[PDB]
Structures are given as structure tokens and as C-alpha cells.
Design a protein around this ligand. Sequence first.
Ligand SMILES: C[C@@H]1CCC(O)=C(C(=O)SCCNC(=O)CCNC(=O)[C@H](O)C(C)(C)COP(=O)(O)OP(=O)(O)OC[C@H]2O[C@@H](n3cnc4c(N)ncnc43)[C@H](O)[C@@H]2OP(=O)(O)O)[C@@]12CCC(=O)O2
Ligand SMILES: C[C@@H]1CCC(O)=C(C(=O)SCCNC(=O)CCNC(=O)[C@H](O)C(C)(C)COP(=O)(O)OP(=O)(O)OC[C@H]2O[C@@H](n3cnc4c(N)ncnc43)[C@H](O)[C@@H]2OP(=O)(O)O)[C@@]12CCC(=O)O2
Lengths: 247, 247, 295, 295
Amino acid sequence: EVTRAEYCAIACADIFSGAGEIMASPMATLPLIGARLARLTTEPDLLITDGEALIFADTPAVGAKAPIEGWMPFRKVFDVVASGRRHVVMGANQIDRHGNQNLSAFGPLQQPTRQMFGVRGAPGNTINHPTSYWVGKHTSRVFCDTVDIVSGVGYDQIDPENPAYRFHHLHRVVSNLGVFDFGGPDHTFRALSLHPGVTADQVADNTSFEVAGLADAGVTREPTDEELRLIREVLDPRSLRDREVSV
Amino acid sequence: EVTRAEYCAIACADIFSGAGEIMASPMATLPLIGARLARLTTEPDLLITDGEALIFADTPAVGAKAPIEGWMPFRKVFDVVASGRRHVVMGANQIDRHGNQNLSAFGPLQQPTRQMFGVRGAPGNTINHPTSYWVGKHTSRVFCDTVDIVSGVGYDQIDPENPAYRFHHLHRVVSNLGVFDFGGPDHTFRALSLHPGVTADQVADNTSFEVAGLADAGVTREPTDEELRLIREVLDPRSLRDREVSV
Amino acid sequence: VSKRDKRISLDDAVGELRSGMTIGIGGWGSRRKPMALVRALLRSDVTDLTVVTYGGPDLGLLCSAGKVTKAYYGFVSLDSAPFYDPWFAKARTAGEIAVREMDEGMVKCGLEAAAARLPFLPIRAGLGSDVRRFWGDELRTVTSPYPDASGKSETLIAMPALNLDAALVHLNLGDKHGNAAYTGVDPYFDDLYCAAAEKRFVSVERVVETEELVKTVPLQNLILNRMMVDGVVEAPNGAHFTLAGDSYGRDEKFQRHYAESAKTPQAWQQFVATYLSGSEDDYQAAVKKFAEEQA
Amino acid sequence: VSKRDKRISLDDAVGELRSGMTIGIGGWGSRRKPMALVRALLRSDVTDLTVVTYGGPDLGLLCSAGKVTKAYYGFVSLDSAPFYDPWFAKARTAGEIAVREMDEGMVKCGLEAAAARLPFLPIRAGLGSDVRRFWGDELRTVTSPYPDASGKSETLIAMPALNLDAALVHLNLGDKHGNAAYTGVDPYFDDLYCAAAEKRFVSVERVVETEELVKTVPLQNLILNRMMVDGVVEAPNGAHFTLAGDSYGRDEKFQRHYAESAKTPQAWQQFVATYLSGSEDDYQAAVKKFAEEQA
Ligand SMILES: C[C@@H]1CCC(O)=C(C(=O)SCCNC(=O)CCNC(=O)[C@H](O)C(C)(C)COP(=O)(O)OP(=O)(O)OC[C@H]2O[C@@H](n3cnc4c(N)ncnc43)[C@H](O)[C@@H]2OP(=O)(O)O)[C@@]12CCC(=O)O2
Ligand SMILES: C[C@@H]1CCC(O)=C(C(=O)SCCNC(=O)CCNC(=O)[C@H](O)C(C)(C)COP(=O)(O)OP(=O)(O)OC[C@H]2O[C@@H](n3cnc4c(N)ncnc43)[C@H](O)[C@@H]2OP(=O)(O)O)[C@@]12CCC(=O)O2
């Protein structure tokens, strides 16, 4: 028996399949478990940090310390961003059909109706290196037709005549309902798999726009026995993952 | 009785008069004695280094260590250069009437007749902050009509329409014969003082171009008793200064 | 004779600031903010400020006093629940401040341009995002004079220099001349804030003699030299309630109380009466009393 | 499973290089140059190189073997008498190399542009100097899109990115994965050389396990991480005859012998026969014998 959060964990690990020797920067608990799971199975050369300034040598449990292998203060993170050698998994208050993302605020730019973080590193992340998103509660308020403020750059912003845009790449969106990318026609939001027990109607009813390939999307793969052991015993023995994954 | 090298030492100290809280960067023994002499008398807020990577707290004798107050590795020197908060005293293989300077090579750029250092930091120094020169043997081969390679920027290179040039300032040239600046008409090489025993004819015979104000130039000031004590007892007890000052 | 003695009080330092200044504030979010200097700003009549910051409760407290006209920032965060600073949020939803929100890497870039006395530096971050709409014509592009191999020329954001009238930073140790060090895992960007500014004030946990400073920390931790500092303030616990490297962590309980007190007129008058209506010593005594009461 | 084991020999590392490459060489003048890697280049047939460096005897030895077609450098110096490197001087006076000589700050700037994948960075250094004549149309200007306060727009040097096919650097300590540290007072620019390059080779005095590395040096000394290195070479005394931080100083006597031996065909054949006609171990044994004989 595999829980919804465990499917989300292996989907978040799969984000990093083939990533090689780059900095994995997950910004929420499930992507964090996923990145560390990938590092312990098929992507050992990933770099990971303690979320503050230390690069870990070994892969620790959620919230644990581990021996270190290097230094990564915030000023040097911006060097990594500009180098391209990174894959970030951010959260999102809004994501539209072409991948524009908002974590800044709702409403007008100079007088919002609700304030969040501001754009943070989302513009630099999305223009420099692979970016993926995690959404713990897949709803039509998150997956909307138009984001209020573009903090993360989507595919309809790209100027193909200007090579400054050539590093943009939105890899995956993983939610509590399934695995998605922007491989639909015109770089539109596309279903790759639905977690076991999730129906196409459930995704459609909770997405404001049409999801490409939804009717034909298969089911998310089973975790291996090793992956279940690593999730349940090594990385997240307290099941902190369950707190983040809605229904 | 005051030696020629002692007049040169106080002239090199006077380079830094009014410099305030900036990095003094002398590149030869006499300017080094001068900078440290200034720091011990009327410019205590000067920053000085050990010539490698350490900022000195106290002012040591030539070649001596002293307690430190900060770190100044080469990469951070370029930050200081760009900040403008520095006054360098360089040497020179050639200096022309408008202050163009060469320490790179003689002859054609791509096939010189004699190779020296290349331009080093001279272009960045002369475009960013006060720059002065030390010449231990004042001759017509140094003070020439045209330098072979412009490593240090002179006054006839300045574009007054482009504010990128607004920090250029050549403060003094000190030689074994006297003290000079570029305050003559059209920013030309001008005599401020001649060291005791030096005649105008001696300067004229050893400079390829006419020296402004030469006939009216007074004699270099006497060192104070304190300055002589600091030079002879504290900063340069082995008289290393004598080795650099010709006749 | 002697190098300049730069030791001054908190109120002296703010006495050098003027309404209408552009002020950079060091630290990051709820991390090593010069909170004692910010509280001294609150006691003063200095207002109409343009603030450049990686924002946290420093910007929140300034907004609680209506002291901010314009803000340049990469983010605003308390780094712990509820994450969003409630006073910054109120100023935003009321339209009380004009914002030049930008990518976090653009703040670093802009400070670096000012430090080098350059009018701009090129950067990719910002392209294709609503950072362009926050800035309008204040943010322009620049095209490379060198095409790429394919023959296409890149057009990048021209990040303008973030020149500052003043910088306020807090560090762990320093001497009376402005040499100063951080202890802990991150310098943040405090050296860049100082290098970008005309008037530079550093508060430190403890003022020591130069020789004690340089024997206490590695060379690489000596991030301010004397050319980067105009005034030095001795302010123990002067980053409270933000964290401060090896000196102390974040006062999470007190930060939560600050954030909750912003919710109503009533709760804020009481917070102000208890913590912000006297001196730094009064604040420190009240904070200590809070920690004892809430154990 | 396991992180990649990047340990390789000197000749393996040079086996990854190709004639015609643009190669950056770390260190500075006669300071922590990857001299063992340079000697391995001399033993190889790799030639027609474009070299980017703060030049010292590394560039001299490459010029002695005719391996340099084009050189980008801020200076060339032995840092001790006779200061000018005699093999670089011979190549220059013979017109054997095309030079893009530049201000020292421009080298740093160009490496920084490449590290950030930018086509250029603006810089003041170079303006008004014969750096413009060394480069011709390869060095262009860029005008600020923001005029200064007076209404005049600044036109600056657009320093192009110094993109490298490979980088060779020497450091004091590292692990088998490419984490590496300097010990001593200056990192020079070795991190920037690696960040600007496609293929990165670091020689180190000693290879240790990761945990020993991070317990031996402060955090700030860990200047290479695993994303910055493709091959690790264990080369004790591998910077000889340049200095190497806390490991050793410059072999001043031997550097003087190198410089004197360049003066005549005769003296150089003997230097080559004794020091450069065998392996790194042969070189190290011969250098030790020289020091004993010259006491
Ligand atoms: C240094 C580097 C630099 C580079 C880099 O990479 C970094 C970054 O940092 S890059 C930033 C990465 N950071 C993220 O990825 C954070 C993403 N954010 C989250 O993950 C959130 O946690 C969340 C999205 C999951 C939930 O957030 P949320 O709580 O705000 O939203 P939500 O719960 O949905 O409720 C929404 C509420 O609004 C209500 N509403 C909806 N419409 C409206 C409307 N029109 N008007 C008014 N209200 C509205 C709705 O009724 C709910 O109200 P209410 O509930 O009814 O009251 C680094 C790394 C380390 C560092 O330091 O920098
Ligand atoms: C990191 C920072 C970066 C920023 C910064 O700021 C730095 C710098 O570093 S910034 C560089 C500062 N550095 C200097 O300022 C050095 C200046 N140089 C000197 O000071 C020299 O020492 C000298 C000038 C006094 C004498 O040099 P010299 O010996 O070459 O000349 P000279 O003796 O006159 O003989 C001349 C011989 O040529 C012969 N000849 C004359 N015409 C010709 C001709 N047409 N062709 C062929 N030959 C000729 C003549 O017959 C003589 O031949 P010969 O004698 O007959 O054989 C830092 C700081 C620390 C660091 O690391 O970087």
C-alpha cells in the first residue's frame, strides 16, 4: 500500500532524472524529500544544501544535519543561478497554461489586494536554468487563466530572436493529483501521469484551463521497494510529507 | 645635512598630502618610504598593505611585518581600484609631456623591440583614481616626446563629453631631480620644485621636452626634524633609499 | 597621530541621516538586520525614505511609522511563519509606498554597479517578467556589441546602479575605526551595501581593539575595512529579533508577537508602548522580560 | 551509489586537451601556477594554444616550446629579478604570438562575464589606453542607457567574455570529487578560471577525504565545489618553482636558474635535458638535487 504523498515523493525525485552534477534546490518538503531520494538512488552527483549556506556531503533526513562538502552563502547562490548549473523546485500561488507563475502578490502591482513575498528569485531562476513547480493542493485558483504578477517566466514571454532567453526551461509541475509538463501544443500544460485513484475529471474540475493529453494520461509509476524504504525509514520517518499533500 | 634620497622621501610623502582615508599603493622603495612617512606624520588614516594581501594596522619599517587590520587579496584590489579610493605611485619606462606613461614594452605592439611587464594595472589605475609617478633616474629617454605604448592614460586622451573619464587625475611626478605635476598649460609637465643642488639646466638637459615653469621653480622644502628621525631611524635605517636614487 | 575614532551612539548615527535619503539596509529577511539602528530611526523624525533592502522586519517597522516612500527590494520575508511581514503588507495594500520590486539577483547586481561607480551592469534576471512592469522606463535594456556565434546579439536588462545616500548594517565584531567582521555562515551583502553608500554606519555586538578583532576571526571574515565605514555603534543584541550568526539565533517567540501585534490598532499601541517608546536599553529590558514570562 | 571519482594523472589530464584550445591558467605571475600540469603540456603534442592568464613562468615555458599562438593577459612577471620572463620576451620580440594584452582588472572582468554566461561586462579600465590598439575591433565600447545626472551618457569598455575550453589550476588540498581549498593569504582567481571553462583540471598538493578537507580549512577557503571541476590530479610540489600559499614559498634560486638558462641555445638544451626530458618525478628529483648542490 502506497500513500498519495509517497507517489508525490517519487514524482519529485523523477524531476531530477538525468540532472547530473547540478545544484538541486527544492523549496518545499515534498520536493526536498524527492531531491534527496534521487541523490540516494540514481543521481548521486546532485549538489544539495542545508537551505542556509552549507553544501552537504551526505544526504540527511528531513531537518537533520549532515557532514558538509562546501560553502554556499546567498551571494554565491546568485553565481550558481547565473551559471545555469541548477534545477529549482519552487512553490506557486498561481500558474497559468503557459507556465507563467506568481508568488509575489495578488492584484495591481502598486496596490495589491494581497501581499506575499515579492518576486524573490523567480525571475532569475526561470530565465537561467531548469525550473519545476510543486503544488500541494491542485485547484482552479492556482491553475488559472492569467496570473496576477509574472514572477516566474512562462513560454509565451520568450523572444526567440534574443539569445538572452535561450536557457529558459520549465521541466515539471508535480501536484497532489499528478505529474505535468509544458509539452502540450504551443508549450501548454500537459498531463504526464495521474496518481493512483485520481481521475481525469478530478484534474479537469480543479484546473481553470484545458489540460493537454488528460484523457490519455497513464498512472504514476509504483515506487521501488528501495524508494519506499528510503522515504519511510531514512528520509522522512515522521511522515512530514503527509502534512503538505492535500487529500 | 640632508641627502638627495631624503629630499626624495619627503617629496614622496607630500604626494599623499590631503589624501584622507584612501589606499596608498606605492610601487617602489622611495614612494613606499614616502607613504609610510606620511602615515606617521600628517595622514594617519591612509590604508597601506604589505604588498601582497594584508592591510597593516601599524606602520612598519621597510621589509618588516606589522600587526594587521584587514584583508586585501588581489581580487579585492580591483574592487578598490574601481571604487576610486586609492592613490598609486607607479614607476615608468617612459612619460610624455601630457602624462602618457609606458611600462609595457618598447616598439611595435605585436612585435616589440624590448619586452617589459605588459600594461599591468596602469590603464585601470589612471582612469579610476589619483596616480603619481616615481622616476629614480631622470633622463630624456624616460621623459620623451612620445611613449611607445600608452599603459598609463595621459591628459590628451580624455574625452570631456564622456563622463567615464571624469576620475582621471595625475597628481605628481617625483624624480631624483625634483617635484613635477601636469599643471602647465594644456596639462603639460610642470616643475614645482628642484631638489637642493639641482639646476634648471640639469633638468632641461635631461628632459626631451620643455618643462613649464622651470626657470621660476623653487627648491624642495627641508624635512622636519621629525621626518628625518622617522626616515633614518624608524622606516629605513639601512638606507635602502640610497640604492634607488641616482646621483 | 591617530586614526579617526568613529564610535558614535545609535541616536548620533540617525542624527546624520536626513528625510528623503535613499538608505540601504543590510542583512537579509529576518537575518542580522540592524534592528537597533531601525528602532533609532523610528524614534527620530527622519522620514520620506527610499529603502533598498532584502526586506524583513526592518522594512516592516519602517512601514509601521510611515517612513517609507519608495522601496527597492528582492523580497520581504520574516523567514518564519507567518512569513509575510504584516506591516509591509498593509503599506502595500494601502498603496502607501511606490515599489521597484526586482529579482533578488538584481539587488546584488545594482549594489555591485554602485560599488564600482558604474551606471549599470547587464543581467539576464528580469527579462520576460513583470519586473519590467514594476519599473517601467526606469529599467531599460542594453544590447551586446558582440553578437553570439550564431550572429544574434543578446539584449539584457541594464540594471541601474543602486547608489545609496546611507547604509545601515550590523556585524558581530569591529574596532573603533570601522574594521569589522561577521561570525557565522553568511556575510549576506553588507560589504556591498557599504561600498554602494556615501554615509556608512555599522552597529556591532562588541567593539574591540584591532588586534583582538584580527586574532578572533579568519582573514576572510574581515569584510569591512576603514574605507567602508563612517560611524561605529556598539549595540549588543543589536540585531534582535533577527538572528546574528554565531552570536544568537532568531527570537522566534518575540517575532511572532511582533507579527501578531500588527493585526489590530489595539495590539499595536500596546506593542509600541512596551517596546518602542523608550531607549534601546528599555527595549532590551522589555525583551528580556518577555522571554522570562513566556518560558 | 557513489559520486564520480575524478582522480586522474597529469598525462591523463593533458590527454583531455586538444591543439587549438583556449586554455586559462590560474595562479598569478610566479604564484601557485599549475607548473606540473604545464610541464605535462610540454611533454605532449598539444600546441597552437590560446592562453588566458596572469602570466608568469607558465607562459614562459609554453613559449619555450612554441605552444602559444595567441595570448590574453594582464601582465607577465616572474615577481622577482629579472622580473621579465625571458621566454615570453623572446616570443614577443620575434612576433611569434598575437597578443590581446589588457588591464589586469579586465582579465577578472572577462572571466566574470564568462562565469555568468554573459557576452560582456562594462568596465572603465582600458579607456584612453593602448589596450584599444592591442585589440582593435575585437574590443568595443558600450553606452549606458541611463545618462548621468548632468545628462551625459557614459561610454565604457565592453569587456567580452573570456570563455575557455579548459582551465588548469593548482590548489593546496582537495578531495577526489573536486572540492578544493587554498591555504595562505590569497585565492587569486582560480575559482573564476574554473567557472569560465568547459573542462576543468585542478592539481592539488594532497588529495584527502571530504571530511578531512572541510575540517582542515575555514568555510571561506573552499573555493571549488564539485560543479567546478572535471579532473583532480594529486601533484605534491606541483606548483614548483612558484610559491604555493602555506605549503611552500618560491624556489628563488631555481627560478633564477630557469631565467638564466633561457639566455642561450646551449644553456637551454642543458636545462631541458636535466629537468624537462622525463616525468614529474624525474623533475622533482632533479630539483631536489639542485637545491642540495646550491646550498
Ligand atoms: C538565495 C536564493 C535566490 C534564488 C532562489 O531561488 C531563492 C528563492 O527563495 S526563490 C523563492 C522560492 N520560494 C517559493 O517557492 C515560495 C512559494 N510560496 C509558497 O510555497 C507558499 O507557501 C504557497 C504558495 C504554497 C502558499 O502560500 P499562501 O499561503 O500565500 O497561499 P494560499 O495558502 O494558497 O492562500 C492564498 C490566499 O489568498 C486568497 N486570495 C486568492 N486570490 C486573491 C485575490 N485576488 N485577492 C486577495 N486574496 C486572494 C485566498 O483566499 C487565500 O487566503 P486565505 O487563506 O483565505 O486567508 C533563494 C534560495 C533560498 C533563499 O532564501 O532565496
Ligand atoms: C594587483 C594590483 C592591480 C593594480 C595595480 O596597481 C597593480 C600593479 O602592479 S600596477 C604595476 C605597477 N608596476 C610598476 O609601476 C612597475 C614600473 N616599472 C619599474 O618600476 C621598472 O623597474 C623601471 C621602469 C624603474 C625600470 O625598468 P627597466 O629595467 O625595464 O628599464 P630601464 O632600467 O630604464 O632600462 C631600459 C632598457 O631598455 C633599453 N631601451 C630603451 N629604449 C629601447 C627600444 N626602443 N628598444 C630596445 N631597448 C630599448 C635601454 O637601453 C635599457 O636597456 P639596457 O639597460 O641597456 O639593457 C597591482 C598591485 C600589486 C600587483 O601585483 O598588481
